[PDB]
Structure formats: structure tokens, C-alpha cells
Design a protein around this ligand. Structure first.
Ligand SMILES: CCCCCCCCCCCCO[C@@H]1O[C@H](CO)[C@@H](O[C@H]2O[C@H](CO)[C@@H](O)[C@H](O)[C@H]2O)[C@H](O)[C@H]1O
Ligand SMILES: CCCCCCCCCCCCO[C@@H]1O[C@H](CO)[C@@H](O[C@H]2O[C@H](CO)[C@@H](O)[C@H](O)[C@H]2O)[C@H](O)[C@H]1O
Lengths: 253, 34, 247, 34
């Protein structure tokens, strides 16, 4: 119905082979060539290296080291009202607002299912029916680690296999279920504000997802849904994170 | 990239000035308890 | 084995589906005759043994048989085979573990797309994996009377589902596109899972028609009420419940 | 294609002569109540 070369590429391109290839290159200690790619990236995407702990591009041994570069604490002060949930990621708001029954906005006019986002987990969907959602978009120029909006006890993590569509205005408007079909990690926490999900969704090239408690979840890509549980916070074996603390990140591969 | 947050019904109000293409920075306000 | 990872399995599936849905007269008939030749199809078993009788290749692929050629066992204590072909593997579910091939296990939870509550129904139970080939009848029939309770469409890959891939591709049945059907029966809760493969990627049930294509990349769950309720769906032992075709 | 059946524990016995590569035909015996 829409006749777009770019949309066709999303379906035509071997997005996974490209993601693997880029992950291979981004893991190489390639000295001057590593440094060149980083300098060209920083120039083309207008990265603010002043915000990084190591502002010198020669300090990074691999591209991925640079892509996941840490910031200076002082440059992201954590709001101190314990009634304030804070932004988990640097970037822009894609969409946000009320979950209209099961319905989340992907773009103006274009909905998707909460149950579909949560891989058919109707019991976890029930926690969030008629609740609230925020979708943050991280770009190549942004810091690529993700932090807690509030204190949380980790209860549940679900790895979901999927595609590696690009994320932009064309895909957000034209690929149905973009965030519900792309590879992703669902994290469920107990918080003071009730149950909270923080879902990390991959994209072409930026396909690798880590959490601080499990390391790299993907790659490799084994094709199946995997579920992990943790007990309530009063119990041995529980996992606890503070507001503003790092909980995961994205990288190439 | 993408990070999606889900919160339970009645539990938070989004900061009222936030909309599509609002700049996000780790640690800035996103929502308040009710 | 290398081909399985390189080949654009879904492009090939879509292409074949397009061709197999065309009312293409002589060309339809040619492809059917070549298929019947190459795969040694027994057309004596079909209701319409005449290959000109089929307006599309898919019509032929899903050709009905004559009742008399598949008598349904009569003991109401006997569950019958759902599909023509060969047993791939069968036996006990060892806690969460199902045998794919000698030396290859897979997770019941992974087969059921993370549905731990449906996995609990079958922990330490029994499983049967039937393999249908291109020569076989491609519709699937009830092993006993059942009330449909739950259907789950699961997106995935379209690996080929032969003895070589069964031996070499980890989680083959848990990663391939598939439909999970859950029934109440006299013998307790029972699943009949229809798993697709390269080219043969289209899955129907009699109650919903074609589930896939299209391929929308999300898990979809449908529920039906208990028996003798409005909107209830009930099927008899040996009755058709679904099928596979190209696309 | 492939069809996978699951039955709850202790509900059926597979007919004993079925093993890997046994020929299947719709309507033939697969398993019996216990
Ligand atoms: C997507 C981002 C792309 C970033 C740029 C990618 C460029 C890829 C170039 C491919 C070749 C680089 O491959 C890289 O070769 C150099 C050789 O100098 C090796 O370098 C390593 O071993 C050699 C000695 O054997 C040492 O002198 C060197 O100090 C050490 O870091 C790396 O172990 C290897 O990873
Ligand atoms: C083609 C080259 O052959 C290479 O071999 C192995 C098979 O063991 C493939 O794949 C293997 O690891 C991948 C990595 O996630 C898994 O999805 C898969 O379960 C496994 O079989 C590679 O993706 C393929 O690229």
C-alpha cells in the first residue's frame, strides 16, 4: 500500500548479518582505525565528549568501549524528591501517556498491544492495563547505558527473540508492532509506586543488550523466550537497585 | 536504542510538560507518585 | 546445515505461497504432476485423483482423502494418530526436557513460548512429534474428542524440519513459527502444536481459517469457553482440526 | 510439517511398538487411557 524504497530495505536487508558484522568490528582493538571510526562517528552525530569520563577518543581500545562510554556522575544529577521517578535514558521522548486498556501509542494514530509487547504474558499485562507508559528513543549520539527511575527489587526478566528493525519516524509509522516484534529484554520490579516494567528494545546494528545482574543477554541469539524470576526484597537471593543507578545498556552486535 | 516504562494504574502522573521529542536526561523528573 | 542459516527462508516461503495460490491452469497442473512424480504421491488415496481437478497447487497440497482410506479406531479409550507421516520422537517429558534427536533436548517452556502455566500442565507428561513430508496428506485430525480452550500463535524462523536439521539446529521446534492448540479431553489437558517449516509456512485451523500468513511478528492468544457454552468449540476424534500449505 | 502432542502425567500410555521413524496414519492407534 505504501511504496517506499527505505521501508522495503527494512524487510529486504539481512539486518541480523549486518548486526553480527558490526558487532565483530566494534569488538576489535584496531588502534588508529578504531580511533578514526570513533572520531568520524563523534563528528557526524555531534557527540558531546565533554560529558564522558574519558573525553579523549584515543582512550577507547574498541568502538563498543566508546559506544558504552561512562559519563561523569556530576553531569547527571539524580532528582532527590523520593516522590519523583527520574528519566532512565538520555535521548528524546518517542511517545508517553495512558495505556488505553491494552493499547500503547507507537506513533500518532498507530497503536500496539501491551500483551504483544510482553510476549503473550497476560498476567504481567494485567498489572499495567489502564496504567501509564513512557517510550524513550536513544540515538547514536546519546549515552547508551540505562538507569533506574526509582528504587526497585528485580522480580522478573524475560528475553524475547525478534527482528532488528531500525527505529525512526518511517518505521514508527509504517511497521506495525515495531517494539512488540523487535528483540528485547523485559524487566519487572517491585517499587514504592507498585509494579514497574523497564523494557530494553534493540534495533539494527545496536542489537546487544546487557543488564548489570546478568551481563550480555544477547548475542548470542538462540531463537527462544527465556524467563528468570527473583524473590521479594525481604528474602535471600533478591536483587535491589537504587534510583539513578545503572541497570543495563545497549551495544553493537 | 529504545526504553519502554510501564506503571500500574493510578500510581504515577507523568511530568505535565513532557511530550513527543522532549529531551530526556538521566536523573531529570519523569513522573510523581499520586 | 550452513544453507539453513544463509538462505532467505521467508522470502522463498512468500514466493512459493504467491505461486501456489495462483489459478494458473496448465502451469498449476504441470507443477502438481512434477511434484507427484518427484515425491511419489499416492493419488489413489485422494477424493479427486485427477491432477487437472486442482485450480491451484495449494488446493492440491491440502487435497482431501477418501474417508474409507483412514478408518478412525472405534475404542473410546484409544487416542489416534493426528497426521500421516513418521514418528520423529516420542515418550516421557523428563521434567521440562523433550528429546528433539539423540543428544539434543529442548525446554517445554520454550516450546510453549514462555507460558509457564501451560508448561506446568505437561511437566513429566508424554509427548509425540510427528514429521509430515511433501508426499504426505497435509491436514491434521483430532487424536480424541476435545473442547478447544486456548490457541497461541508464536512467531519464529522457518528452518527446514527434516532429520538433518532435527540433529543439528538447537531448539528447532521451539524457534520455528507454530500454533499451540490446548483442549480439555477425557484424558486430561492435551496440546496439539502445528510447527511450520521453509516453504510449508502456512498454518490453518478449522475454527479460525489461515492463522499465518500474514506474519505480524507478535504472540497472539485466543481463549474459548468450557463445553456446552455459547462460542464453545468442540471437535470429535479423527475429525480435521487444521492443515499446512505453502506461503 | 510437524505436529507435537503433549498429555498430562499418568493420563495415557503410548502404544508400545511406536518408536523413532514408525509410520503414522490418521485414525490408527497412538495411545490408550490408563
Ligand atoms: C563498527 C566499528 C568499526 C571499528 C573499526 C573496525 C576495523 C576492523 C579492522 C580488522 C582488523 C583489526 O584486528 C586487530 O588487529 C590487530 C593487529 O594490529 C590486533 O592487535 C592486537 O594484537 C597485536 C599483536 O598480535 C598487538 O600489537 C596489539 O597491541 C593488540 O591490540 C587485534 O587483536 C585485532 O583485533
Ligand atoms: C553459516 C555459518 O555457520 C554458523 O554455524 C552455526 C551453527 O552451529 C550457526 O548458529 C549457531 O549459533 C547461533 C548463534 O546465535 C545460534 O542461533 C544457533 O542456535 C547455533 O546453531 C551460525 O549462526 C552460523 O553462521
Amino acid at each position: 500500500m505504501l511504496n517506499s524504497f527505505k521501508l522495503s530495505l527494512q524487510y529486504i536487508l539481512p539486518k541480523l548479518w549486518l548486526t553480527r558484522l558490526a558487532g565483530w568490528g566494534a569488538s576489535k582493538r584496531a588502534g588508529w582505525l578504531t580511533k578514526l571510526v570513533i572520531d568520524l562517528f563523534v563528528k557526524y552525530y555531534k557527540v558531546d565528549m565533554k560529558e564522558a569520563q574519558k573525553p579523549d577518543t584515543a582512550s577507547y581500545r574498541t568502538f563498543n568501549e566508546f559506544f558504552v562510554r561512562p559519563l561523569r556522575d556530576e553531569v547527571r544529577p539524580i532528582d532527590t524528591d523520593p516522590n519523583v521517578l527520574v528519566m532512565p535514558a538520555d535521548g528524546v521522548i518517542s511517545q508517553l501517556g495512558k495505556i488505553e486498556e491494552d493499547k500503547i501509542l507507537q506513533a500518532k494514530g498507530h497503536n500496539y498491544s501491551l500483551e504483544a509487547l510482553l510476549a503473550g504474558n497476560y498476567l504481567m499485562a494485567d498489572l499495567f492495563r489502564n496504567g501509564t507508559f513512557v517510550t524513550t528513543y536513544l540515538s547514536p549520539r546519546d549515552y547508551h547505558r540505562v538507569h533506574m527511575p526509582c528504587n526497585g527489587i528485580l522480580r522478573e526478566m524475560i528475553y524475547v527473540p525478534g527482528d532488528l528493525f531500525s527505529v525512526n519516524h518511517l518505521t514508527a509509522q509504517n511497521v506495525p508492532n515495531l517494539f512488540a516484534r523487535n528483540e528485547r529484554v523485559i524487566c519487572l520490579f517491585d517499587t514504592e509506586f507498585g509494579p514497574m516494567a523497564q523494557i530494553l528494545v534493540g534495533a539494527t546494528i545496536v542489537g546487544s543488550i546487557e543488564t548489570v545482574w546478568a551481563g550480555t543477554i544477547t548475542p548470542p541469539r538462540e531463537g527462544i523466550i527465556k524467563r528468570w524470576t527473583w524473590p521479594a526484597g525481604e528474602n535471600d537471593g533478591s536483587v535491589a537497585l537504587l534510583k539513578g543507578q545503572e541497570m543495563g545498556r545497549f551495544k553493537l552486535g | 536504542x529504545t526504553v519502554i516504562n510501564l506503571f500500574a494504574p493510578g500510581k504515577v502522573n507523568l511530568v505535565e510538560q513532557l511530550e513527543s521529542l522532549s529531551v530526556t536526561k538521566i536523573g531529570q523528573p519523569l513522573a510523581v507518585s499520586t
